[PDB]
Amino acid sequence: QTSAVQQKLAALEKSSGGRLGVALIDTADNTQVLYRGDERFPMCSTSKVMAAAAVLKQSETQKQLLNQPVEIKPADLVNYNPIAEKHVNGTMTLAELSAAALQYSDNTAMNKLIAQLGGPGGVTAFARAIGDETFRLDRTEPTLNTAIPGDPRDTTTPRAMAQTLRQLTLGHALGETQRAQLVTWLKGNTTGAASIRAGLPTSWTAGDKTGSGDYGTTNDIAVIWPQGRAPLVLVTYFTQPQQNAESRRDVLASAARIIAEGL
Ligand SMILES: *[B]([O])([O])[C]([N]C(=O)[C]C1=[C][C]=[C]S1)C1=[C]C(C([O])=O)=[C][C]=[C]1
Secondary structure (H helix, E strand, O other), X not given: OOOHHHHHHHHHHHHHOXXXXXXXXXXXXXXXXXXXXXXXXXXXXXXXXXXXXXXXXXXOOOOOHHHOEXXXXXXXXXXXXXXXXXXXXXXXXXXXHHHHHHHHOOHHHHXXXXXXXXXXXXXXXXXXXXXXXXXXXXXXXXXXXXXXXXXXXXXXXXXXXXXXXXXXXXXXXXXXXXXXXXXXXXXXXXXXXXXXXXXXXXXXXEEEEEEEEOOOEEEXXXXXXOOOOOOEEEEEEEEOOOOOOOXXXXXHHHHHHHHHHHO
């Protein structure tokens, strides 16, 4: 069946020129709304949530891990690293790297998280350990953003990512202290006001992680506390046919608005 909300999302997608993927979980009733929910999309920086969460999981059995210093060298800098470049020839802790990755989308910080986990496959391993059979991280920053149509590397589906985000932020995939820390980090994101949150009423609060990459790939994943009801988890992925396409955060905002209006 095709719902009114799915038809609206199809209409948005048609006018956008690209390919849109949406997954909502409403924790008021556990119901879901999906649009291309089982199609793969390049994650780009939304994968930084899984890496940060994997390090939080490791910290459950090492109380001092988040205070562990990591050397930042000139050669570690990649294409976008507004926090890490301030610490070259010094150190950042794994907490500082997690915060920088999540709240500023620092790509050097992400690479240090991936290294702590033993490479991209360590992030995938953590996904599998919390019941996500779909997620795959194959590369580091910045090549995980190539976003080539048809390429499975560094992809997931909207359905899988919404489920996982729910388990991480509202469920019990992490210990309570770690879940709270993840939520605190997401709520302090600096990059999200033009994406999902732009389509929500102002009164609502949210935490989110954006992503962007080649093929005009424009993504956001969010945990949302609407006015007067139980939290939502919402994933919005968008990708375009030309490698040099421009970002379309407005499409994510529009998808979020359709979802909000359909509640
Ligand atoms: B993250 O990987 O999406 C990250 N993207 C990039 O580094 C962009 C590209 C690299 C190579 C080809 S494209 C990133 C995300 C954000 C954000 O979420 O706002 C900001 C900066 C970098």
